[PDB]
Chain A
Amino acid sequence: PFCVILPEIQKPERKIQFKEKVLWTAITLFIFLVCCYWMRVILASNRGLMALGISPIVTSGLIMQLLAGATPKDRALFNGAQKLFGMTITIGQSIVYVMTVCLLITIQLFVAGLIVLLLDELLQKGYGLGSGISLFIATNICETIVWKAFSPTTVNTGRGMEFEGAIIALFHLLALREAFYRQNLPNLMNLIATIFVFAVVIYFQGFRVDLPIKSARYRGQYNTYPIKLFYTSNIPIILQSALVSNLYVISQMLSPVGGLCHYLSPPESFGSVLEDPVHAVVYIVFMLGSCAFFSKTWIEVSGSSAKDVAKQLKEQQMVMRGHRETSMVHELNRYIPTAAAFGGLCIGALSVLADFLGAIGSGTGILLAVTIIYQYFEIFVKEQS
């Protein structure tokens, strides 16, 4: 009864040109990147007042929606309740920073309390660069694209000159040893391997089983219901394996590349590392099995199983050519359950191939990037006739 004293915000209800979204919604992230758990950084951000602000904003929405699902009265409690947790999430990272007179440092958080709260609701309207995935692709591609520009702008030398760049250093070396030591700034060699990963993934992205579908009333044009080989967005599958990896690491750190328990760890080496295969081969086995396990369970909960798809098609009045409505499920069951199990296995195997080859971005994460950039590609092509 005490929650009916907070108003909400308004939204536009008119057609908006795509140019405005592609030009304006893609900017204003520099303020968050002014400063640009190092292994754990790949989750949302790197700095520990800036913090991350990616997970908390969507977490507030998830909490409000689950509270609603646990009506104008409840509608007014949606936009108003996010401000309740908006202060909690901002102070949450700061107090964590304190544990692992310092009270004066809390003044720095004054600005950061509301920096990302305003942007949370506005970016969703328009092109569709929401769900925080637009933030992830921008920073993930950044570490790949600005990697080339780092070499000319790098001032640190270490042992060899770098202020003038390292891609072309014929005067410095020459005779010339083009096969230098790629232990720092591997910009010369990692680009060779990563482009192979880009080509292979897009090839497997286009795999799908096309199911003949027709309107239940009109004779004529036949459409196909596409069941993608992955059949699951990369974020639901890869995050469920990324989160558990992060959860494992933080647990061991509280309770691993050096001076840490090495019972479970991803392999990392130039070329190949092999002392006891009982560790390396087990890692991929648990990685592949978990991905298929995560992908197979996601469709059971996300309303994308064979049973749910048929209900969607029945609602849209779409039928198979020569099957009854009840036979929709059986034909879908021929491909849907096995595509999730095998698609999750394949995307996990692509990560292992990406990690082993040592591509840009340390292998993992680029699978998320290539899929989402493809995800908006289907919008881009269809909006251009």
Chain B
Amino acid sequence: EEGARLLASKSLLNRYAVEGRDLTLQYNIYNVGSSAALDVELSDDSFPPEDFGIVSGMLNVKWDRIAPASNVSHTVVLRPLKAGYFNFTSATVTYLAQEDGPVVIGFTSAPGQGGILAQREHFLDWAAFGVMTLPSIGVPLLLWYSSKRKYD
């Protein structure tokens, strides 16, 4: 009898979980009304094709079910290709309400950009970058200690 319809906004949770992490987009629903909605539509219209790849090509998922039994799929597995700057553009979640029929055009677009550098040559990236140069850390100290032992 009330509203509280789909609010599946894409948030900038981590931007770094593990090396080669594939984004697990998840959709949240919070509704208390006793009625039901039909003809779900999950479309990946606004996604970066260069940095994130969709599992089932162009995702166009139709569910048309309101039941605690189960759901078709809400765990979208975006598989990245290479390290760089990734943008969480948006995720299209429309509903073809059987009560009315026209598309409920709703997609949450956010300017969330994150950087993941090369894992092998954030934490692992910057750590590997810092530990890359070995001689500059030890050789000056080696010479200093040699001078100390020659003088002490």
**Do chains A and B make direct contact within the complex (CB under 8 angstroms)?**
no
Residues on B facing A (Cβ under 8 Å):
none
